[PDB]
Design a protein around this ligand. Structure first.
Ligand SMILES: CCCCCCCCCCCCCCCCCC(=O)OC[C@H](COP(=O)([O-])OCC[N+](C)(C)C)OC(=O)CCCCCCCCCCCCCCCCC
Ligand SMILES: CCCCCCCCCCCCCCCCCC(=O)OC[C@H](COP(=O)([O-])OCC[N+](C)(C)C)OC(=O)CCCCCCCCCCCCCCCCC
Ligand SMILES: CCCCCCCCCCCCCCCCCC(=O)OC[C@H](COP(=O)([O-])OCC[N+](C)(C)C)OC(=O)CCCCCCCCCCCCCCCCC
Ligand SMILES: CCCCCCCCCCCCCCCCCC(=O)OC[C@H](COP(=O)(O)OCCN)OC(=O)CCCCCCCCCCCCCCCCC
Lengths: 459, 64, 173, 120, 99, 57, 60, 94, 303, 63
């Protein structure tokens, strides 16, 4: 699988040795090239995963993530074109290195064949993002933003490490294939429930879980524009991809003690969606809506119904995209006005009509309107939950109450309505914003026509 | 920007753990959760009381 | 008819014989006559075009067949070589078993619509034959979860097996 | 473990019986990474002394990689030797001590009874 | 003065310098360039040439293999009257039921 | 146009493809490292043909 | 109120992050800041000997 | 332009900070009624009567007639709660 | 067999053509309002040709022109329930739309977004008549929100009006309240009857569809504006009188009740389930007609 | 705004028409596969089993 790994490793000499003017022209022109190279990984067998080597392998679950990450990397490049034009060239090369290194650690992480190799490359991603969030951030609190990020993720990461080595000494291998074939029932002993607690709370923290979610509002809001998309789009989803992987040996204790988490997600998803409708900062909305959708997929894995694993993958990519346009859009209002208050800028179609067109179709994508894979994945979660419990619908049905209650709400107060006559700052839309808008939303309608590949391994 | 800082930032620097704040947090935090736990734990086992000695309909339920 | 009735049985074709005792020219028939002449014939010739050009070269495909492996039952415990084959074999059977209830569903789907309100009795055998397919499908696969496995399938099969074996002994009385 | 191994000679980088093991290849990925590590020391040295970080002191860089490769190559010989030594008394102990190491007549899944957990 | 600091710089509107700007760089020749890069592969071969690749996967997950096989198997047991697939697959002959 | 400037403007481009095709080699190089069961997988013990050597490279 | 001001902005942010970070902060100065006079330092060494030798009695 | 004072600080206990916080929200000294101070987090912010943005004078030359706002004048903590699109606090005939 | 399906399937195709000319902007501004007028008009006149087949033959038939994916035992396919309910609803519907949008271009004549409006009407039929032709309940749901989020856009024809934006909020809210039961029916259908096809749902003979018909009854309450979720039509009148005439007179409100009559093979199976339909329906008639007894407008009384 | 719109479809159509005419050519110029039975003599290659010429093409070179 070094088809994709090495050219990204080499991309660091590429950007570092590139000339003064190109750099970003260089950075994109080859990151797109790597994207179609990673588009090859769409070749799955039925159920036997693509085992490329002893340490690297991929399956129907990992591959959609790989294409998401690799194709994402050009997007923050062009997204960061505006924000970081003033800075000198050397840090420009360093910033791209952080982006490439981040995507580098992502692709190996999703493709590791040994659990600890996944873990070492799991939390290896906070190191570059901590640099991105803290150094290149904009507002003052960004200092405390990074601390909240790493400490939250680490507070659960270390228990996983102690658990992982324990399984190594107990079973003899943490490799996905061996642990899957030699999967054994995790008994109900108090020792084993804490083992389950160790192997789950790590992903739950950066899931996030209701109550264990403060980092995203304190990080995504003050993260740099490029950094903000990457966190929500994919760096949310390491825990998820790990979660469906480690859940092969935690049975049957999962069906017995997932209730507190199924609780905290269900109430949290309504709670997060409701508070999402009542923030004064637009950037907090995509952050709070993100966890609301993200709280949904934790429900999927807990019931571990085949249908639940169906929508877990689809919603992951769907939301992972969905947060991307909104953060891109929410960015576009910011630097134009140097504020993230939706109240300050209202009715932008009277000034930016094309931006509004992109705004609404991303919004209705967040609405989970079929045939978009946002709904079908999200819908499969509903069906699995009903199989788990018929009553489940009402609490989550309350989530199909708040989403559109806010997901069109900023539309009618950011892109829709009248304009304040004092902001002459608002200007025409540079084609970059619409162009990246095109590569952002056009895919989601494209693979909508063909949902089986991003459906997941349960096909 | 006085309002924006107020609505988000000023809360905890001015927050004080009064007894009523704990009660409201209880009946809006752990409280509603236990509501969902008791209702969801019940029907779940109520379903589990159905399957074992065969009193549940599974004529078409082959998409578990 | 690239398919065949043994897998896809369909009701026989019985059409009425209209006797237009009326005098008004039947507009419906004239709409067909203009339709086949104006619409079918040109696209048919285009369809007749794609025939012999497809006939000037006809590369053949063949079926992909797999030799039946020893099952997990004879697969040695904790063994990893012959576990591979039996796990592969079971999952293909899993994918196989989904497509046959699909085929019965498709047969079920066609039975109602093509037989109108008479499907209440015309699908009586079609309705009954699904139930044995579905119930046996559940006995093959049920409550296996996302991480289903050939071992777990046998564990369920065993779990049912001694329960009925003990019940049969109890039924002996 | 193995400082108490019989015949062990302290202060001896590579003992004689180590040579019976396959010497690490020149293109061994771990070896070439050690060379890549030597390269990375080259950039930093030019960086600390604020010299052209890519074209200054190529002689320094050439020494900075070759020295890492040499100490690398010898280190991997020792690395393989200890793992081979650990695997040696490994199989010496299993053969000389049969009773303490039972080989259970493991039997296929058709004869075992693993409980099925009905998930839902 | 306290902290000697520069005045806050004003946003450089790309369109005022060249009113054919693209939000890519100051220099127009590189600016029109950066479009021809993204409006190259980005939309051209990642989406369009990408779509034909992903939409033309050779038998992704062999669902057609199961299909024609499912057609193939059902006629066999329907020809000799067997009720196609059976409640159990690991047939009773080779398993070892306890006691 | 002068050869030196085209090197001094467009030379980092030509390295990304060869970096990729380099990877293809180790992917091929990795393949024979684990031949192991060469034509003794149960599905694929097809009888050897003299024209070739084994089922796959 | 119940969403941001009560629970999210305060309560969940009070229990785990603020309180635990306070605990680190609270007893740091009890253990980090010390008087610096030489006498008490070796005086502290004293009782360490007995508790090691007598209280838990690592010898037994 | 905005360093430290404008943002809410503590609850203005004393009359001196009562007047300073009244000046902080550019209101008069006498009409300044800060929010109740009991584990509430509002502090400097004043009590705003339930007057929605639909209820305000639609014939006034508002700087922002979107929700009938002006420039510089104080703003309700729950402003977005009661705006013309959302819930309204307006008189009814009965 | 040769005719019937291909003709009406062309109707779905041919008035989608105005849309992807509109995106390609091959329309020369003022030509588009008349251009779509023509295409809808032939879409009418062609729709009678399948209709004439129904008066004489009376036959109906379901088309599955595409297969989306196979969820193990569920193979979602592009299935169309083409029948008497489907075919005859076509000509009456869009001829009414063709009739009104002419009155629109005379009325709606000054706002320079004539084309943007007219295409907005054009895709509106596309989502409508796919509901009445849809066979799998998923396809019906696709059109269910399709009209719903598009009523939001259409009634919000003027972003200057904040009442319009306000009106859309409850219009989507009440519509969203309805489709919760649609999800509930979907959830029940996907678990219990494990199917999506309307033909499959009824032909399983689910004689105890308590939870589904509760969901469909809830679905009507939003779409068909029953009691509780009535006042969104008193809100949707703010959208231009043409489009208000087009959507919120009888063209997409009936989709909710048409859903129940689609489910008629299982709608009336439970006598009790019938009962609160009469209950929900009766209170609307008393309440809504009471409201129209005094209305100082010319829109509320009709609604 | 309109400039970005027309050229973005221009670039989409730039490489879209060649694959559009290509996909039309393959199913109307060089045929589609049909089922057969191996006469037990020719070793069937992996890309041979497949339906569409492009499907066998991609499998032959990229699989
Ligand atoms: C091993 C670890 C355990 C053993 C070692 C520690 C033993 C001592 C534990 C208590 C230490 C002292 C606590 C001090 C304290 O509470 O100060 C008042 C603290 C700090 O108050 P404060 O100073 O923040 O109050 C002012 C607030 N602002 C800034 C907004 C004006 O009170 C609170 O934090 C609120 C009440 C308690 C809330 C937490 C209780 C529930 C915890 C839930 C998570 C549990 C996991
Ligand atoms: C970074 C990744 C790698 C991390 C691991 C450390 C790498 C850097 C250090 C490697 C060299 C140091 C160890 C080997 C060495 O120089 O002498 C070993 C040894 C040191 O002598 P020694 O091992 O006899 O005595 C030292 C005693 N112990 C083992 C407890 C440390 O040199 C010899 O000549 C070996 C004699 C026999 C060994 C038994
Ligand atoms: C229809 C045509 C659609 C074309 C779409 C082009 C863009 C999307 C694919 C980009 C390339 C994906 C990766 C790839 O093929 O790498 C070279 C690939 C990498 O794979 P490889 O070099 O290991 O070769 C595998 C195939 N065999 C074994 C037959 C040689 O090169 C080849 O496949 C040769
Ligand atoms: C395969 C090898 C690839 C690398 C070697 C070949 C590179 C050229 C490839 C063909 C390019 C065709 C278009 C050429 C336009 C030239 C415009 C021009 O002259 O710009 C020059 C200028 C730099 O200054 P100067 O060179 O001094 O000239 C101006 C002096 N006043 O201003 C500039 O900014 C110059 C920028 C021009 C960039 C041209 C494209 C570079 C990238 C090409 C490869 C991209 C794909 C890589 C992978 C290919 C294989 C898959």
């Amino acid at each position: 699988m070094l088809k994709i790994i090495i050219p990204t490793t080499m991309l660091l000499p590429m950007t570092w040795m590139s000339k003064h003017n190109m750099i970003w022209i260089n950075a994109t022109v080859h990151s797109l090239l790597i994207s179609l190279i990673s588009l090859s990984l769409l070749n799955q067998l039925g159920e036997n995963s693509l085992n490329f080597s002893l340490t690297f392998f991929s399956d129907s679950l990992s591959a959609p993530l790989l294409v998401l990450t690799t194709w994402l990397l050009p997007l923050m490049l062009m997204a960061s074109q505006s924000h970081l034009s003033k800075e000198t060239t050397t840090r420009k090369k360093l910033y791209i290195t952080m982006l490439i290194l981040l995507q580098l650690f992502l692709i190996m992480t999703f493709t590791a064949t040994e659990l600890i190799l996944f873990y070492i490359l799991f939390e290896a991603t906070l190191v570059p993002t901590l640099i991105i969030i803290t150094r290149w951030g904009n507002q003052t609190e960004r200092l405390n933003a990074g601390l909240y990020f790493l400490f939250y993720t680490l507070a659960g990461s270390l228990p996983l490490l102690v658990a992982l080595v324990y399984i190594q000494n107990t079973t003899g291998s943490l490799n996905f294939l061996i642990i899957h074939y030699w999967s054994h029932p995790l008994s109900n002993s108090w020792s084993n429930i804490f083992m389950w607690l160790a192997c789950i709370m790590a992903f739950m923290v950066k899931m996030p879980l209701y109550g264990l979610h403060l980092w995203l509002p304190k990080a995504h809001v003050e993260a740099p524009i490029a950094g903000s998309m990457v966190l929500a789009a994919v760096l949310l989803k390491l825990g998820g991809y790990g979660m469906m992987r480690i859940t092969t040996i935690l049975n049957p204790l999962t069906n017995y003690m997932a209730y507190p988490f199924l609780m905290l997600s269900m109430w949290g998803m309504i709670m997060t969606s409701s508070i999402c409708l009542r923030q004064t900062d637009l950037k907090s909305l995509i952050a709070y809506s993100s966890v609301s959708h993200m709280a949904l997929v934790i429900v999927a894995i807990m019931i571990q119904t085949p249908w639940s694993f169906m929508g877990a993958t689809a919603l992951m990519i769907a939301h992972g995209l969905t947060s991307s346009m909104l953060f891109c859009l929410a960015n576009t209002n910011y630097e134009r006005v140097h504020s993230r208050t939706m109240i300050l800028a209202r009715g932008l179609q009277t000034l930016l009509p094309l931006m509004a067109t992109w705004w609404l179709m991303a919004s209705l994508t967040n609405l989970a309107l079929p045939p978009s894979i946002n709904l079908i994945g999200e819908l499969f979660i509903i069906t699995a939950s009903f199989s788990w419990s018929n009553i489940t619908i009402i609490l989550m049905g309350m989530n199909m109450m708040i989403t559109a209650l806010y997901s069109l709400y900023m539309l009618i107060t950011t892109q829709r309505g009248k304009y304040t006559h004092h902001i002459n700052n608002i200007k025409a839309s540079f084609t970059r914003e619409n162009a990246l808008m095109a590569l952002h939303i056009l895919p989601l309608l494209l693979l909508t026509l063909n949902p089986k590949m991003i459906l997941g391994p349960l096909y | 920007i006085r309002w924006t800082y107020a609505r988000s930032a000023n809360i905890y620097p001015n927050f004080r753990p009064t007894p009523k704040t704990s009660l409201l947090g209880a009946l809006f935090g752990i409280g509603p959760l236990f509501f969902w736990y008791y209702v969801f734990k019940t029907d779940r086992d109520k379903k589990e009381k159905l399957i074992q000695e065969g009193k549940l309909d599974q004529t078409f339920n082959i998409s578990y | 008819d690239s398919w065949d009735k043994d897998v896809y049985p369909e009701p026989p074709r019985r059409t009425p014989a209209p006797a237009p005792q009326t005098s008004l020219p039947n507009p419906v028939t004239y709409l067909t006559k203009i339709f086949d002449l104006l619409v079918d014939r040109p696209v048919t010739l285009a369809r007749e075009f794609i025939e012999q050009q497809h006939a000037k070269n006809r590369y053949y495909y063949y079926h992909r067949e797999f030799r039946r492996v020893p099952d997990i039952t004879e697969c040695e415990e904790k063994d990893i070589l012959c576990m591979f084959e039996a796990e592969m074999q079971w999952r293909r059977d899993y994918k196989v078993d989904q497509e046959i209830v699909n085929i019965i569903q498709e047969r079920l789907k066609a039975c109602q619509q093509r037989e109108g309100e008479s499907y209440r009795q015309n699908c009586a055998k079609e309705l009954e034959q699904f139930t044995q397919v579905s119930k046996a499908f559940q006995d093959r696969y049920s409550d296996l979860g996302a991480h289903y496995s050939a071992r777990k399938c046998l564990a369920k099969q065993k779990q049912r097996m001694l329960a009925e074996r003990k019940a049969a002994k109890e039924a002996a009385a | 473990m193995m400082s108490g191994r019989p015949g062990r000679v302290p202060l001896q980088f590579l003992p004689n019986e180590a040579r019976s093991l396959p010497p690490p290849k020149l293109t061994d990925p771990r070896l070439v990474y050690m060379g890549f590590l030597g390269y990375c020391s080259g950039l930093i040295d030019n960086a600390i002394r604020r010299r052209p970080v890519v074209s200054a002191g190529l002689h320094r860089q050439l020494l900075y990689v070759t020295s890492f490769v040499f100490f690398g190559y010898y280190l991997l010989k020792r690395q393989d030797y200890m793992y081979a030594l650990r695997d040696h008394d490994m199989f010496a102990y299993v053969k000389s001590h049969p009773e303490d190491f039972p080989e259970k007549d493991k039997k296929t899944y058709g004869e075992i009874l693993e409980e099925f957990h009905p998930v839902r | 003065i306290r902290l000697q600091e520069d005045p806050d710089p004003e946003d450089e509107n790309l369109y005022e310098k060249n009113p054919d700007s693209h939000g890519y760089d100051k220099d127009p020749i590189v600016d029109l360039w950066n479009m021809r890069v993204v409006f190259f592969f980005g939309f051209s071969i990642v989406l369009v040439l990408g779509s034909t690749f992903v939409a033309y996967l050779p038998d992704y997950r062999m669902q057609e293999w199961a299909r024609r096989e499912a057609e193939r198997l059902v006629k066999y047991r329907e020809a000799n009257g067997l009720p196609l697939m059976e409640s159990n697959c690991f047939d009773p002959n080779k398993i070892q039921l306890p006691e | 146009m002068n050869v030196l400037q085209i090197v001094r403007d467009h030379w980092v481009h030509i390295l990304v493809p060869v970096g990729f095709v380099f990877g293809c080699y180790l992917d091929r190089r990795s393949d024979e490292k684990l031949t192991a069961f060469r034509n003794k997988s149960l599905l694929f013990k097809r009888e050897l043909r003299p024209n070739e050597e084994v089922t796959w490279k | 109120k119940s969403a941001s001001s009560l629970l999210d902005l305060i309560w969940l942010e009070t229990i785990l992050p603020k309180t635990t970070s306070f605990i680190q902060m609270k007893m740091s100065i009890m253990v980090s800041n010390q008087k610096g006079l030489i006498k008490l330092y070796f005086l502290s060494f004293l009782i360490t000997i007995m508790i090691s030798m007598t209280l838990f009695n690592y010898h037994e | 332009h905005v360093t430290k004072d404008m943002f809410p600080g503590p609850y203005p206990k004393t009359p001196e900070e009562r007047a300073a916080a009244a000046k902080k929200y550019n209101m008069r000294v006498e009409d300044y009624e800060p929010y109740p101070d009991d584990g509430m987090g509002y502090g400097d912010y004043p009590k705003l009567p339930d007057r929605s943005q639909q209820e305000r004078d639609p014939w006034y030359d508002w700087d922002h007639p979107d929700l009938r706002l002006n420039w510089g004048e104080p703003i309700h903590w729950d402003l977005d709660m009661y705006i013309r699109n959302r819930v309204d606090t307006s008189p009814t005939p009965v | 067999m040769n005719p019937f399906a291909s003709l009406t399937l062309t109707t779905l195709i041919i008035l989608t053509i105005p849309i992807m000319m509109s995106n390609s902007n091959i329309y020369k501004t003022n030509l588009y309002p008349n251009y779509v007028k023509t295409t809808v008009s032939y879409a009418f006149t062609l729709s009678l040709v399948p209709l004439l087949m129904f008066m004489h033959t009376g036959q109906e038939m379901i088309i599955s022109n595409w297969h989306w994916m196979t969820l193990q035992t569920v193979e979602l396919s592009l299935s169309f329930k083409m029948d008497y309910f489907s075919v005859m609803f076509i000509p009456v519907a869009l001829f009414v739309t063709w009739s009104i949008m002419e009155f629109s271009m005379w009325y709606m004549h000054s706002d320079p977004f004539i084309n943007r409006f007219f295409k907005y009407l054009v895709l509106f039929l596309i989502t409508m008549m796919i509901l009445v032709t849809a066979n799998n309940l998923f396809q019906l749901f696709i059109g269910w929100e399709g009209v719903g989020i598009m009523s939001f856009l259409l009634i919000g024809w003027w972003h200057g009006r904040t009442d319009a934006n306000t009106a859309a909020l409850q219009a989507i809210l009440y519509n969203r309240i309805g489709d919760i039961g649609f999800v509930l029916s979907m959830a029940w259908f996907l678990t219990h009857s494990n199917a999506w096809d309307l033909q499959q749902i009824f032909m399983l003979n689910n004689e105890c569809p308590n939870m589904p018909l509760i969901g469909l009854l809830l679905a009507a309450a939003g779409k068909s504006a029953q009691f509780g979720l009535h006042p969104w039509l008193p809100s949707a009148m703010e959208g231009p009188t043409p489009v208000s005439a087009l959507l919120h007179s009888s063209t997409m409100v009936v989709a909710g009740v048409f859903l129940l009559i689609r489910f008629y093979p299982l709608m009336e199976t439970n006598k009790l389930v019938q009962t609160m339909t009469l209950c929900l329906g009766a209170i609307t008639t008393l309440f809504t007609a009471l409201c129209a007894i005094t209305q100082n407008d010319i829109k509320k009384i009709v609604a | 705004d309109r400039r970005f719109l027309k050229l973005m479809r221009f670039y989409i159509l730039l490489t879209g028409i060649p694959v559009a005419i290509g996909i039309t050519l393959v199913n109307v110029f060089i045929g589609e596969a049909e089922l057969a039975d191996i006469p037990e003599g020719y070793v069937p290659e992996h890309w041979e089993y497949f339906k569409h010429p492009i499907s066998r093409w991609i499998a032959r070179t990229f699989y």
